[PDB]
Design a protein around this ligand. Structure first.
Ligand SMILES: CC(=O)N[C@H]1[C@H]([C@H](O)[C@H](O)CO)O[C@@](O[C@H]2[C@@H](O)[C@@H](CO)O[C@@H](O[C@H]3[C@H](O)[C@@H](O)[C@@H](O)O[C@@H]3CO)[C@@H]2O)(C(=O)O)C[C@@H]1O
Ligand code: NA
Length: 163
């Protein structure tokens, strides 16, 4: 499609501002992680359908982090953003997205990192205020695509309905 650059292999990079990074993960685990190395460590984890509240170990920024996770949905996969604001602090969970297409997206824009939240096919966006935001480097652990912001409508369409 003319609004979808890629696909690209899993990589560490500094994503350009005002571009949505569309992620196409497969199995459960860590989808993407990013930090400004100041006061924001952010990652997105993926949980398969039908998971009762349980402790799972995730490799976040090179260390084993145990988080209590659940997915009450029997049909939809669950993306959860996890965030800490100090290097030694605990990760808290935010902006879940319940997803049928199993696509996620992240964007650096206007002092923030934006992601999707809610339930497909009616997903919306949410954001995380991030100091010195365009220094944020990210590691995607799955294949991804690039879509500009001026067609966020298109990214939202992909999130809600798939490729
Ligand atoms: C997707 C999402 O939740 N986005 C919000 C984020 C994240 O929750 C946060 O970045 C994860 O670390 O938070 C935003 O700002 C909120 C954050 O700074 C929290 C920290 O405690 O405070 C919120 O305001 C509080 C306020 O301090 C209280 O007095 C009371 O009124 O409640 C409000 C709401 O909890 C900040 O709004 C962010 O921009 O990073 C807001 C995002 O919507
Ligand atoms: Na989210």
């Amino acid at each position: 499609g003319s609004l979808l650059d890629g696909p690209y292999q899993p990589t560490t990079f500094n994503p350009p501002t005002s571009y949505w990074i569309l992620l196409a993960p497969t199995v459960e685990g860590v989808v993407i992680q990013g930090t400004n190395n100041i006061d924001r460590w952010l990652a997105t984890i993926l949980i398969e359908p039908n998971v009762q509240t349980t402790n799972r170990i995730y490799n976040l920024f090179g260390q084993q982090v145990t988080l209590s996770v659940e997915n009450t949905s029997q049909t939809q996969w669950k993306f959860i953003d996890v965030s800490k604001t100090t290097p030694t602090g605990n990760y808290t969970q935010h902006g879940p997205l319940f997803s049928t297409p199993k696509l996620y997206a992240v964007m650096k824009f206007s002092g923030r990192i934006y992601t999707y939240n809610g339930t497909t096919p009616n997903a919306t966006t949410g954001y995380y205020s991030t100091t010195n935001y365009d220094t944020v480097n990210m590691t995607s652990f799955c294949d991804f695509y690039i879509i500009p912001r001026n067609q966020e409508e298109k990214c939202t369409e992909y999130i809600n309905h798939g490729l």
